[PDB]
Structure 1
Amino acid sequence: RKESYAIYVYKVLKQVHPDTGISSKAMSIMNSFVNDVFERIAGEASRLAHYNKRSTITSREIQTAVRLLLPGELAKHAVSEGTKAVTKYTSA
């Protein structure tokens, strides 16, 4: 069994471009990209937690890592999306 983000990437693509497909090589590129940004954000969250002598990675750590890593407009939009997701999650 091999795990990949191909299914979720396909779902997102269908949400954004319902009539547009994706080739296998492009899907591999997308999986690699998702893994790369995941590892980068998690590594920055880990460094932030270790610097502040905190044993837990919380939403604040991920938000700060996103602000540090992503450029301006992407960073602010991602922060808004994450805050919205967390707010919806806590209220359900």
Structure 2
Amino acid sequence: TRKESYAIYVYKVLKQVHPDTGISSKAMSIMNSFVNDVFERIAGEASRLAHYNKRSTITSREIQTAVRLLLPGELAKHAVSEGTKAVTKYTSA
């Protein structure tokens, strides 16, 4: 039975930030669980908001708004920038 994860991705970004520093499997699964939790956080929040907007579609503006709701101050700011970057990089595709 195939069980998906992100250890590949967390290791990728680890190297991208710290090629030297290693990783433990315990903390690895911790990271995985954590990102799952925060993704469900943002998912529920954005869905709730869109339901308030009564909009059956979920777009990036919702994501920005709801992460702003989620993140303590400057993080979000920083966050949204790269996010914008992303979609720009993807809209420029």
Q: Tell me the TM-score normalised to structure 1 length.
A: 0.98
Query: How far does residue 73 in structure 1 lie from its aligned partner after superposition?
Result: 1.1
CA distance in 1, matches of 2:10, 2:49: 29
Query: How far does residue 68 in structure 1 lie from its aligned partner after superposition?
Result: 0.1
Query: How far does residue 13 in structure 1 lie from its aligned partner after superposition?
Result: 0.2
Q: Share of identical aligned residues, percent?
A: 100
Query: How far does residue 28 in structure 1 lie from its aligned partner after superposition?
Result: 0.7
Query: How far does residue 7 in structure 1 lie from its aligned partner after superposition?
Result: 0.6
Q: Helix, strand or coil: the match of 2:58?
A: coil
Contact 1:41 1:62 in 2 (8 A): yes
CA distance in 1, matches of 2:24, 2:71: 27
Q: Deviations over 1:33-81 (max 9, x none)?
A: 1101100011111001000110100000110110001110111111111
The size of the alignment, in residue pairs, is 92
Contact 1:5 1:34 in 2 (8 A): no
Cα-Cα RMSD = 0.6
Contact 1:6 1:31 in 2 (8 A): yes
Q: Tell me the TM-score normalised to structure 2 length.
A: 0.97
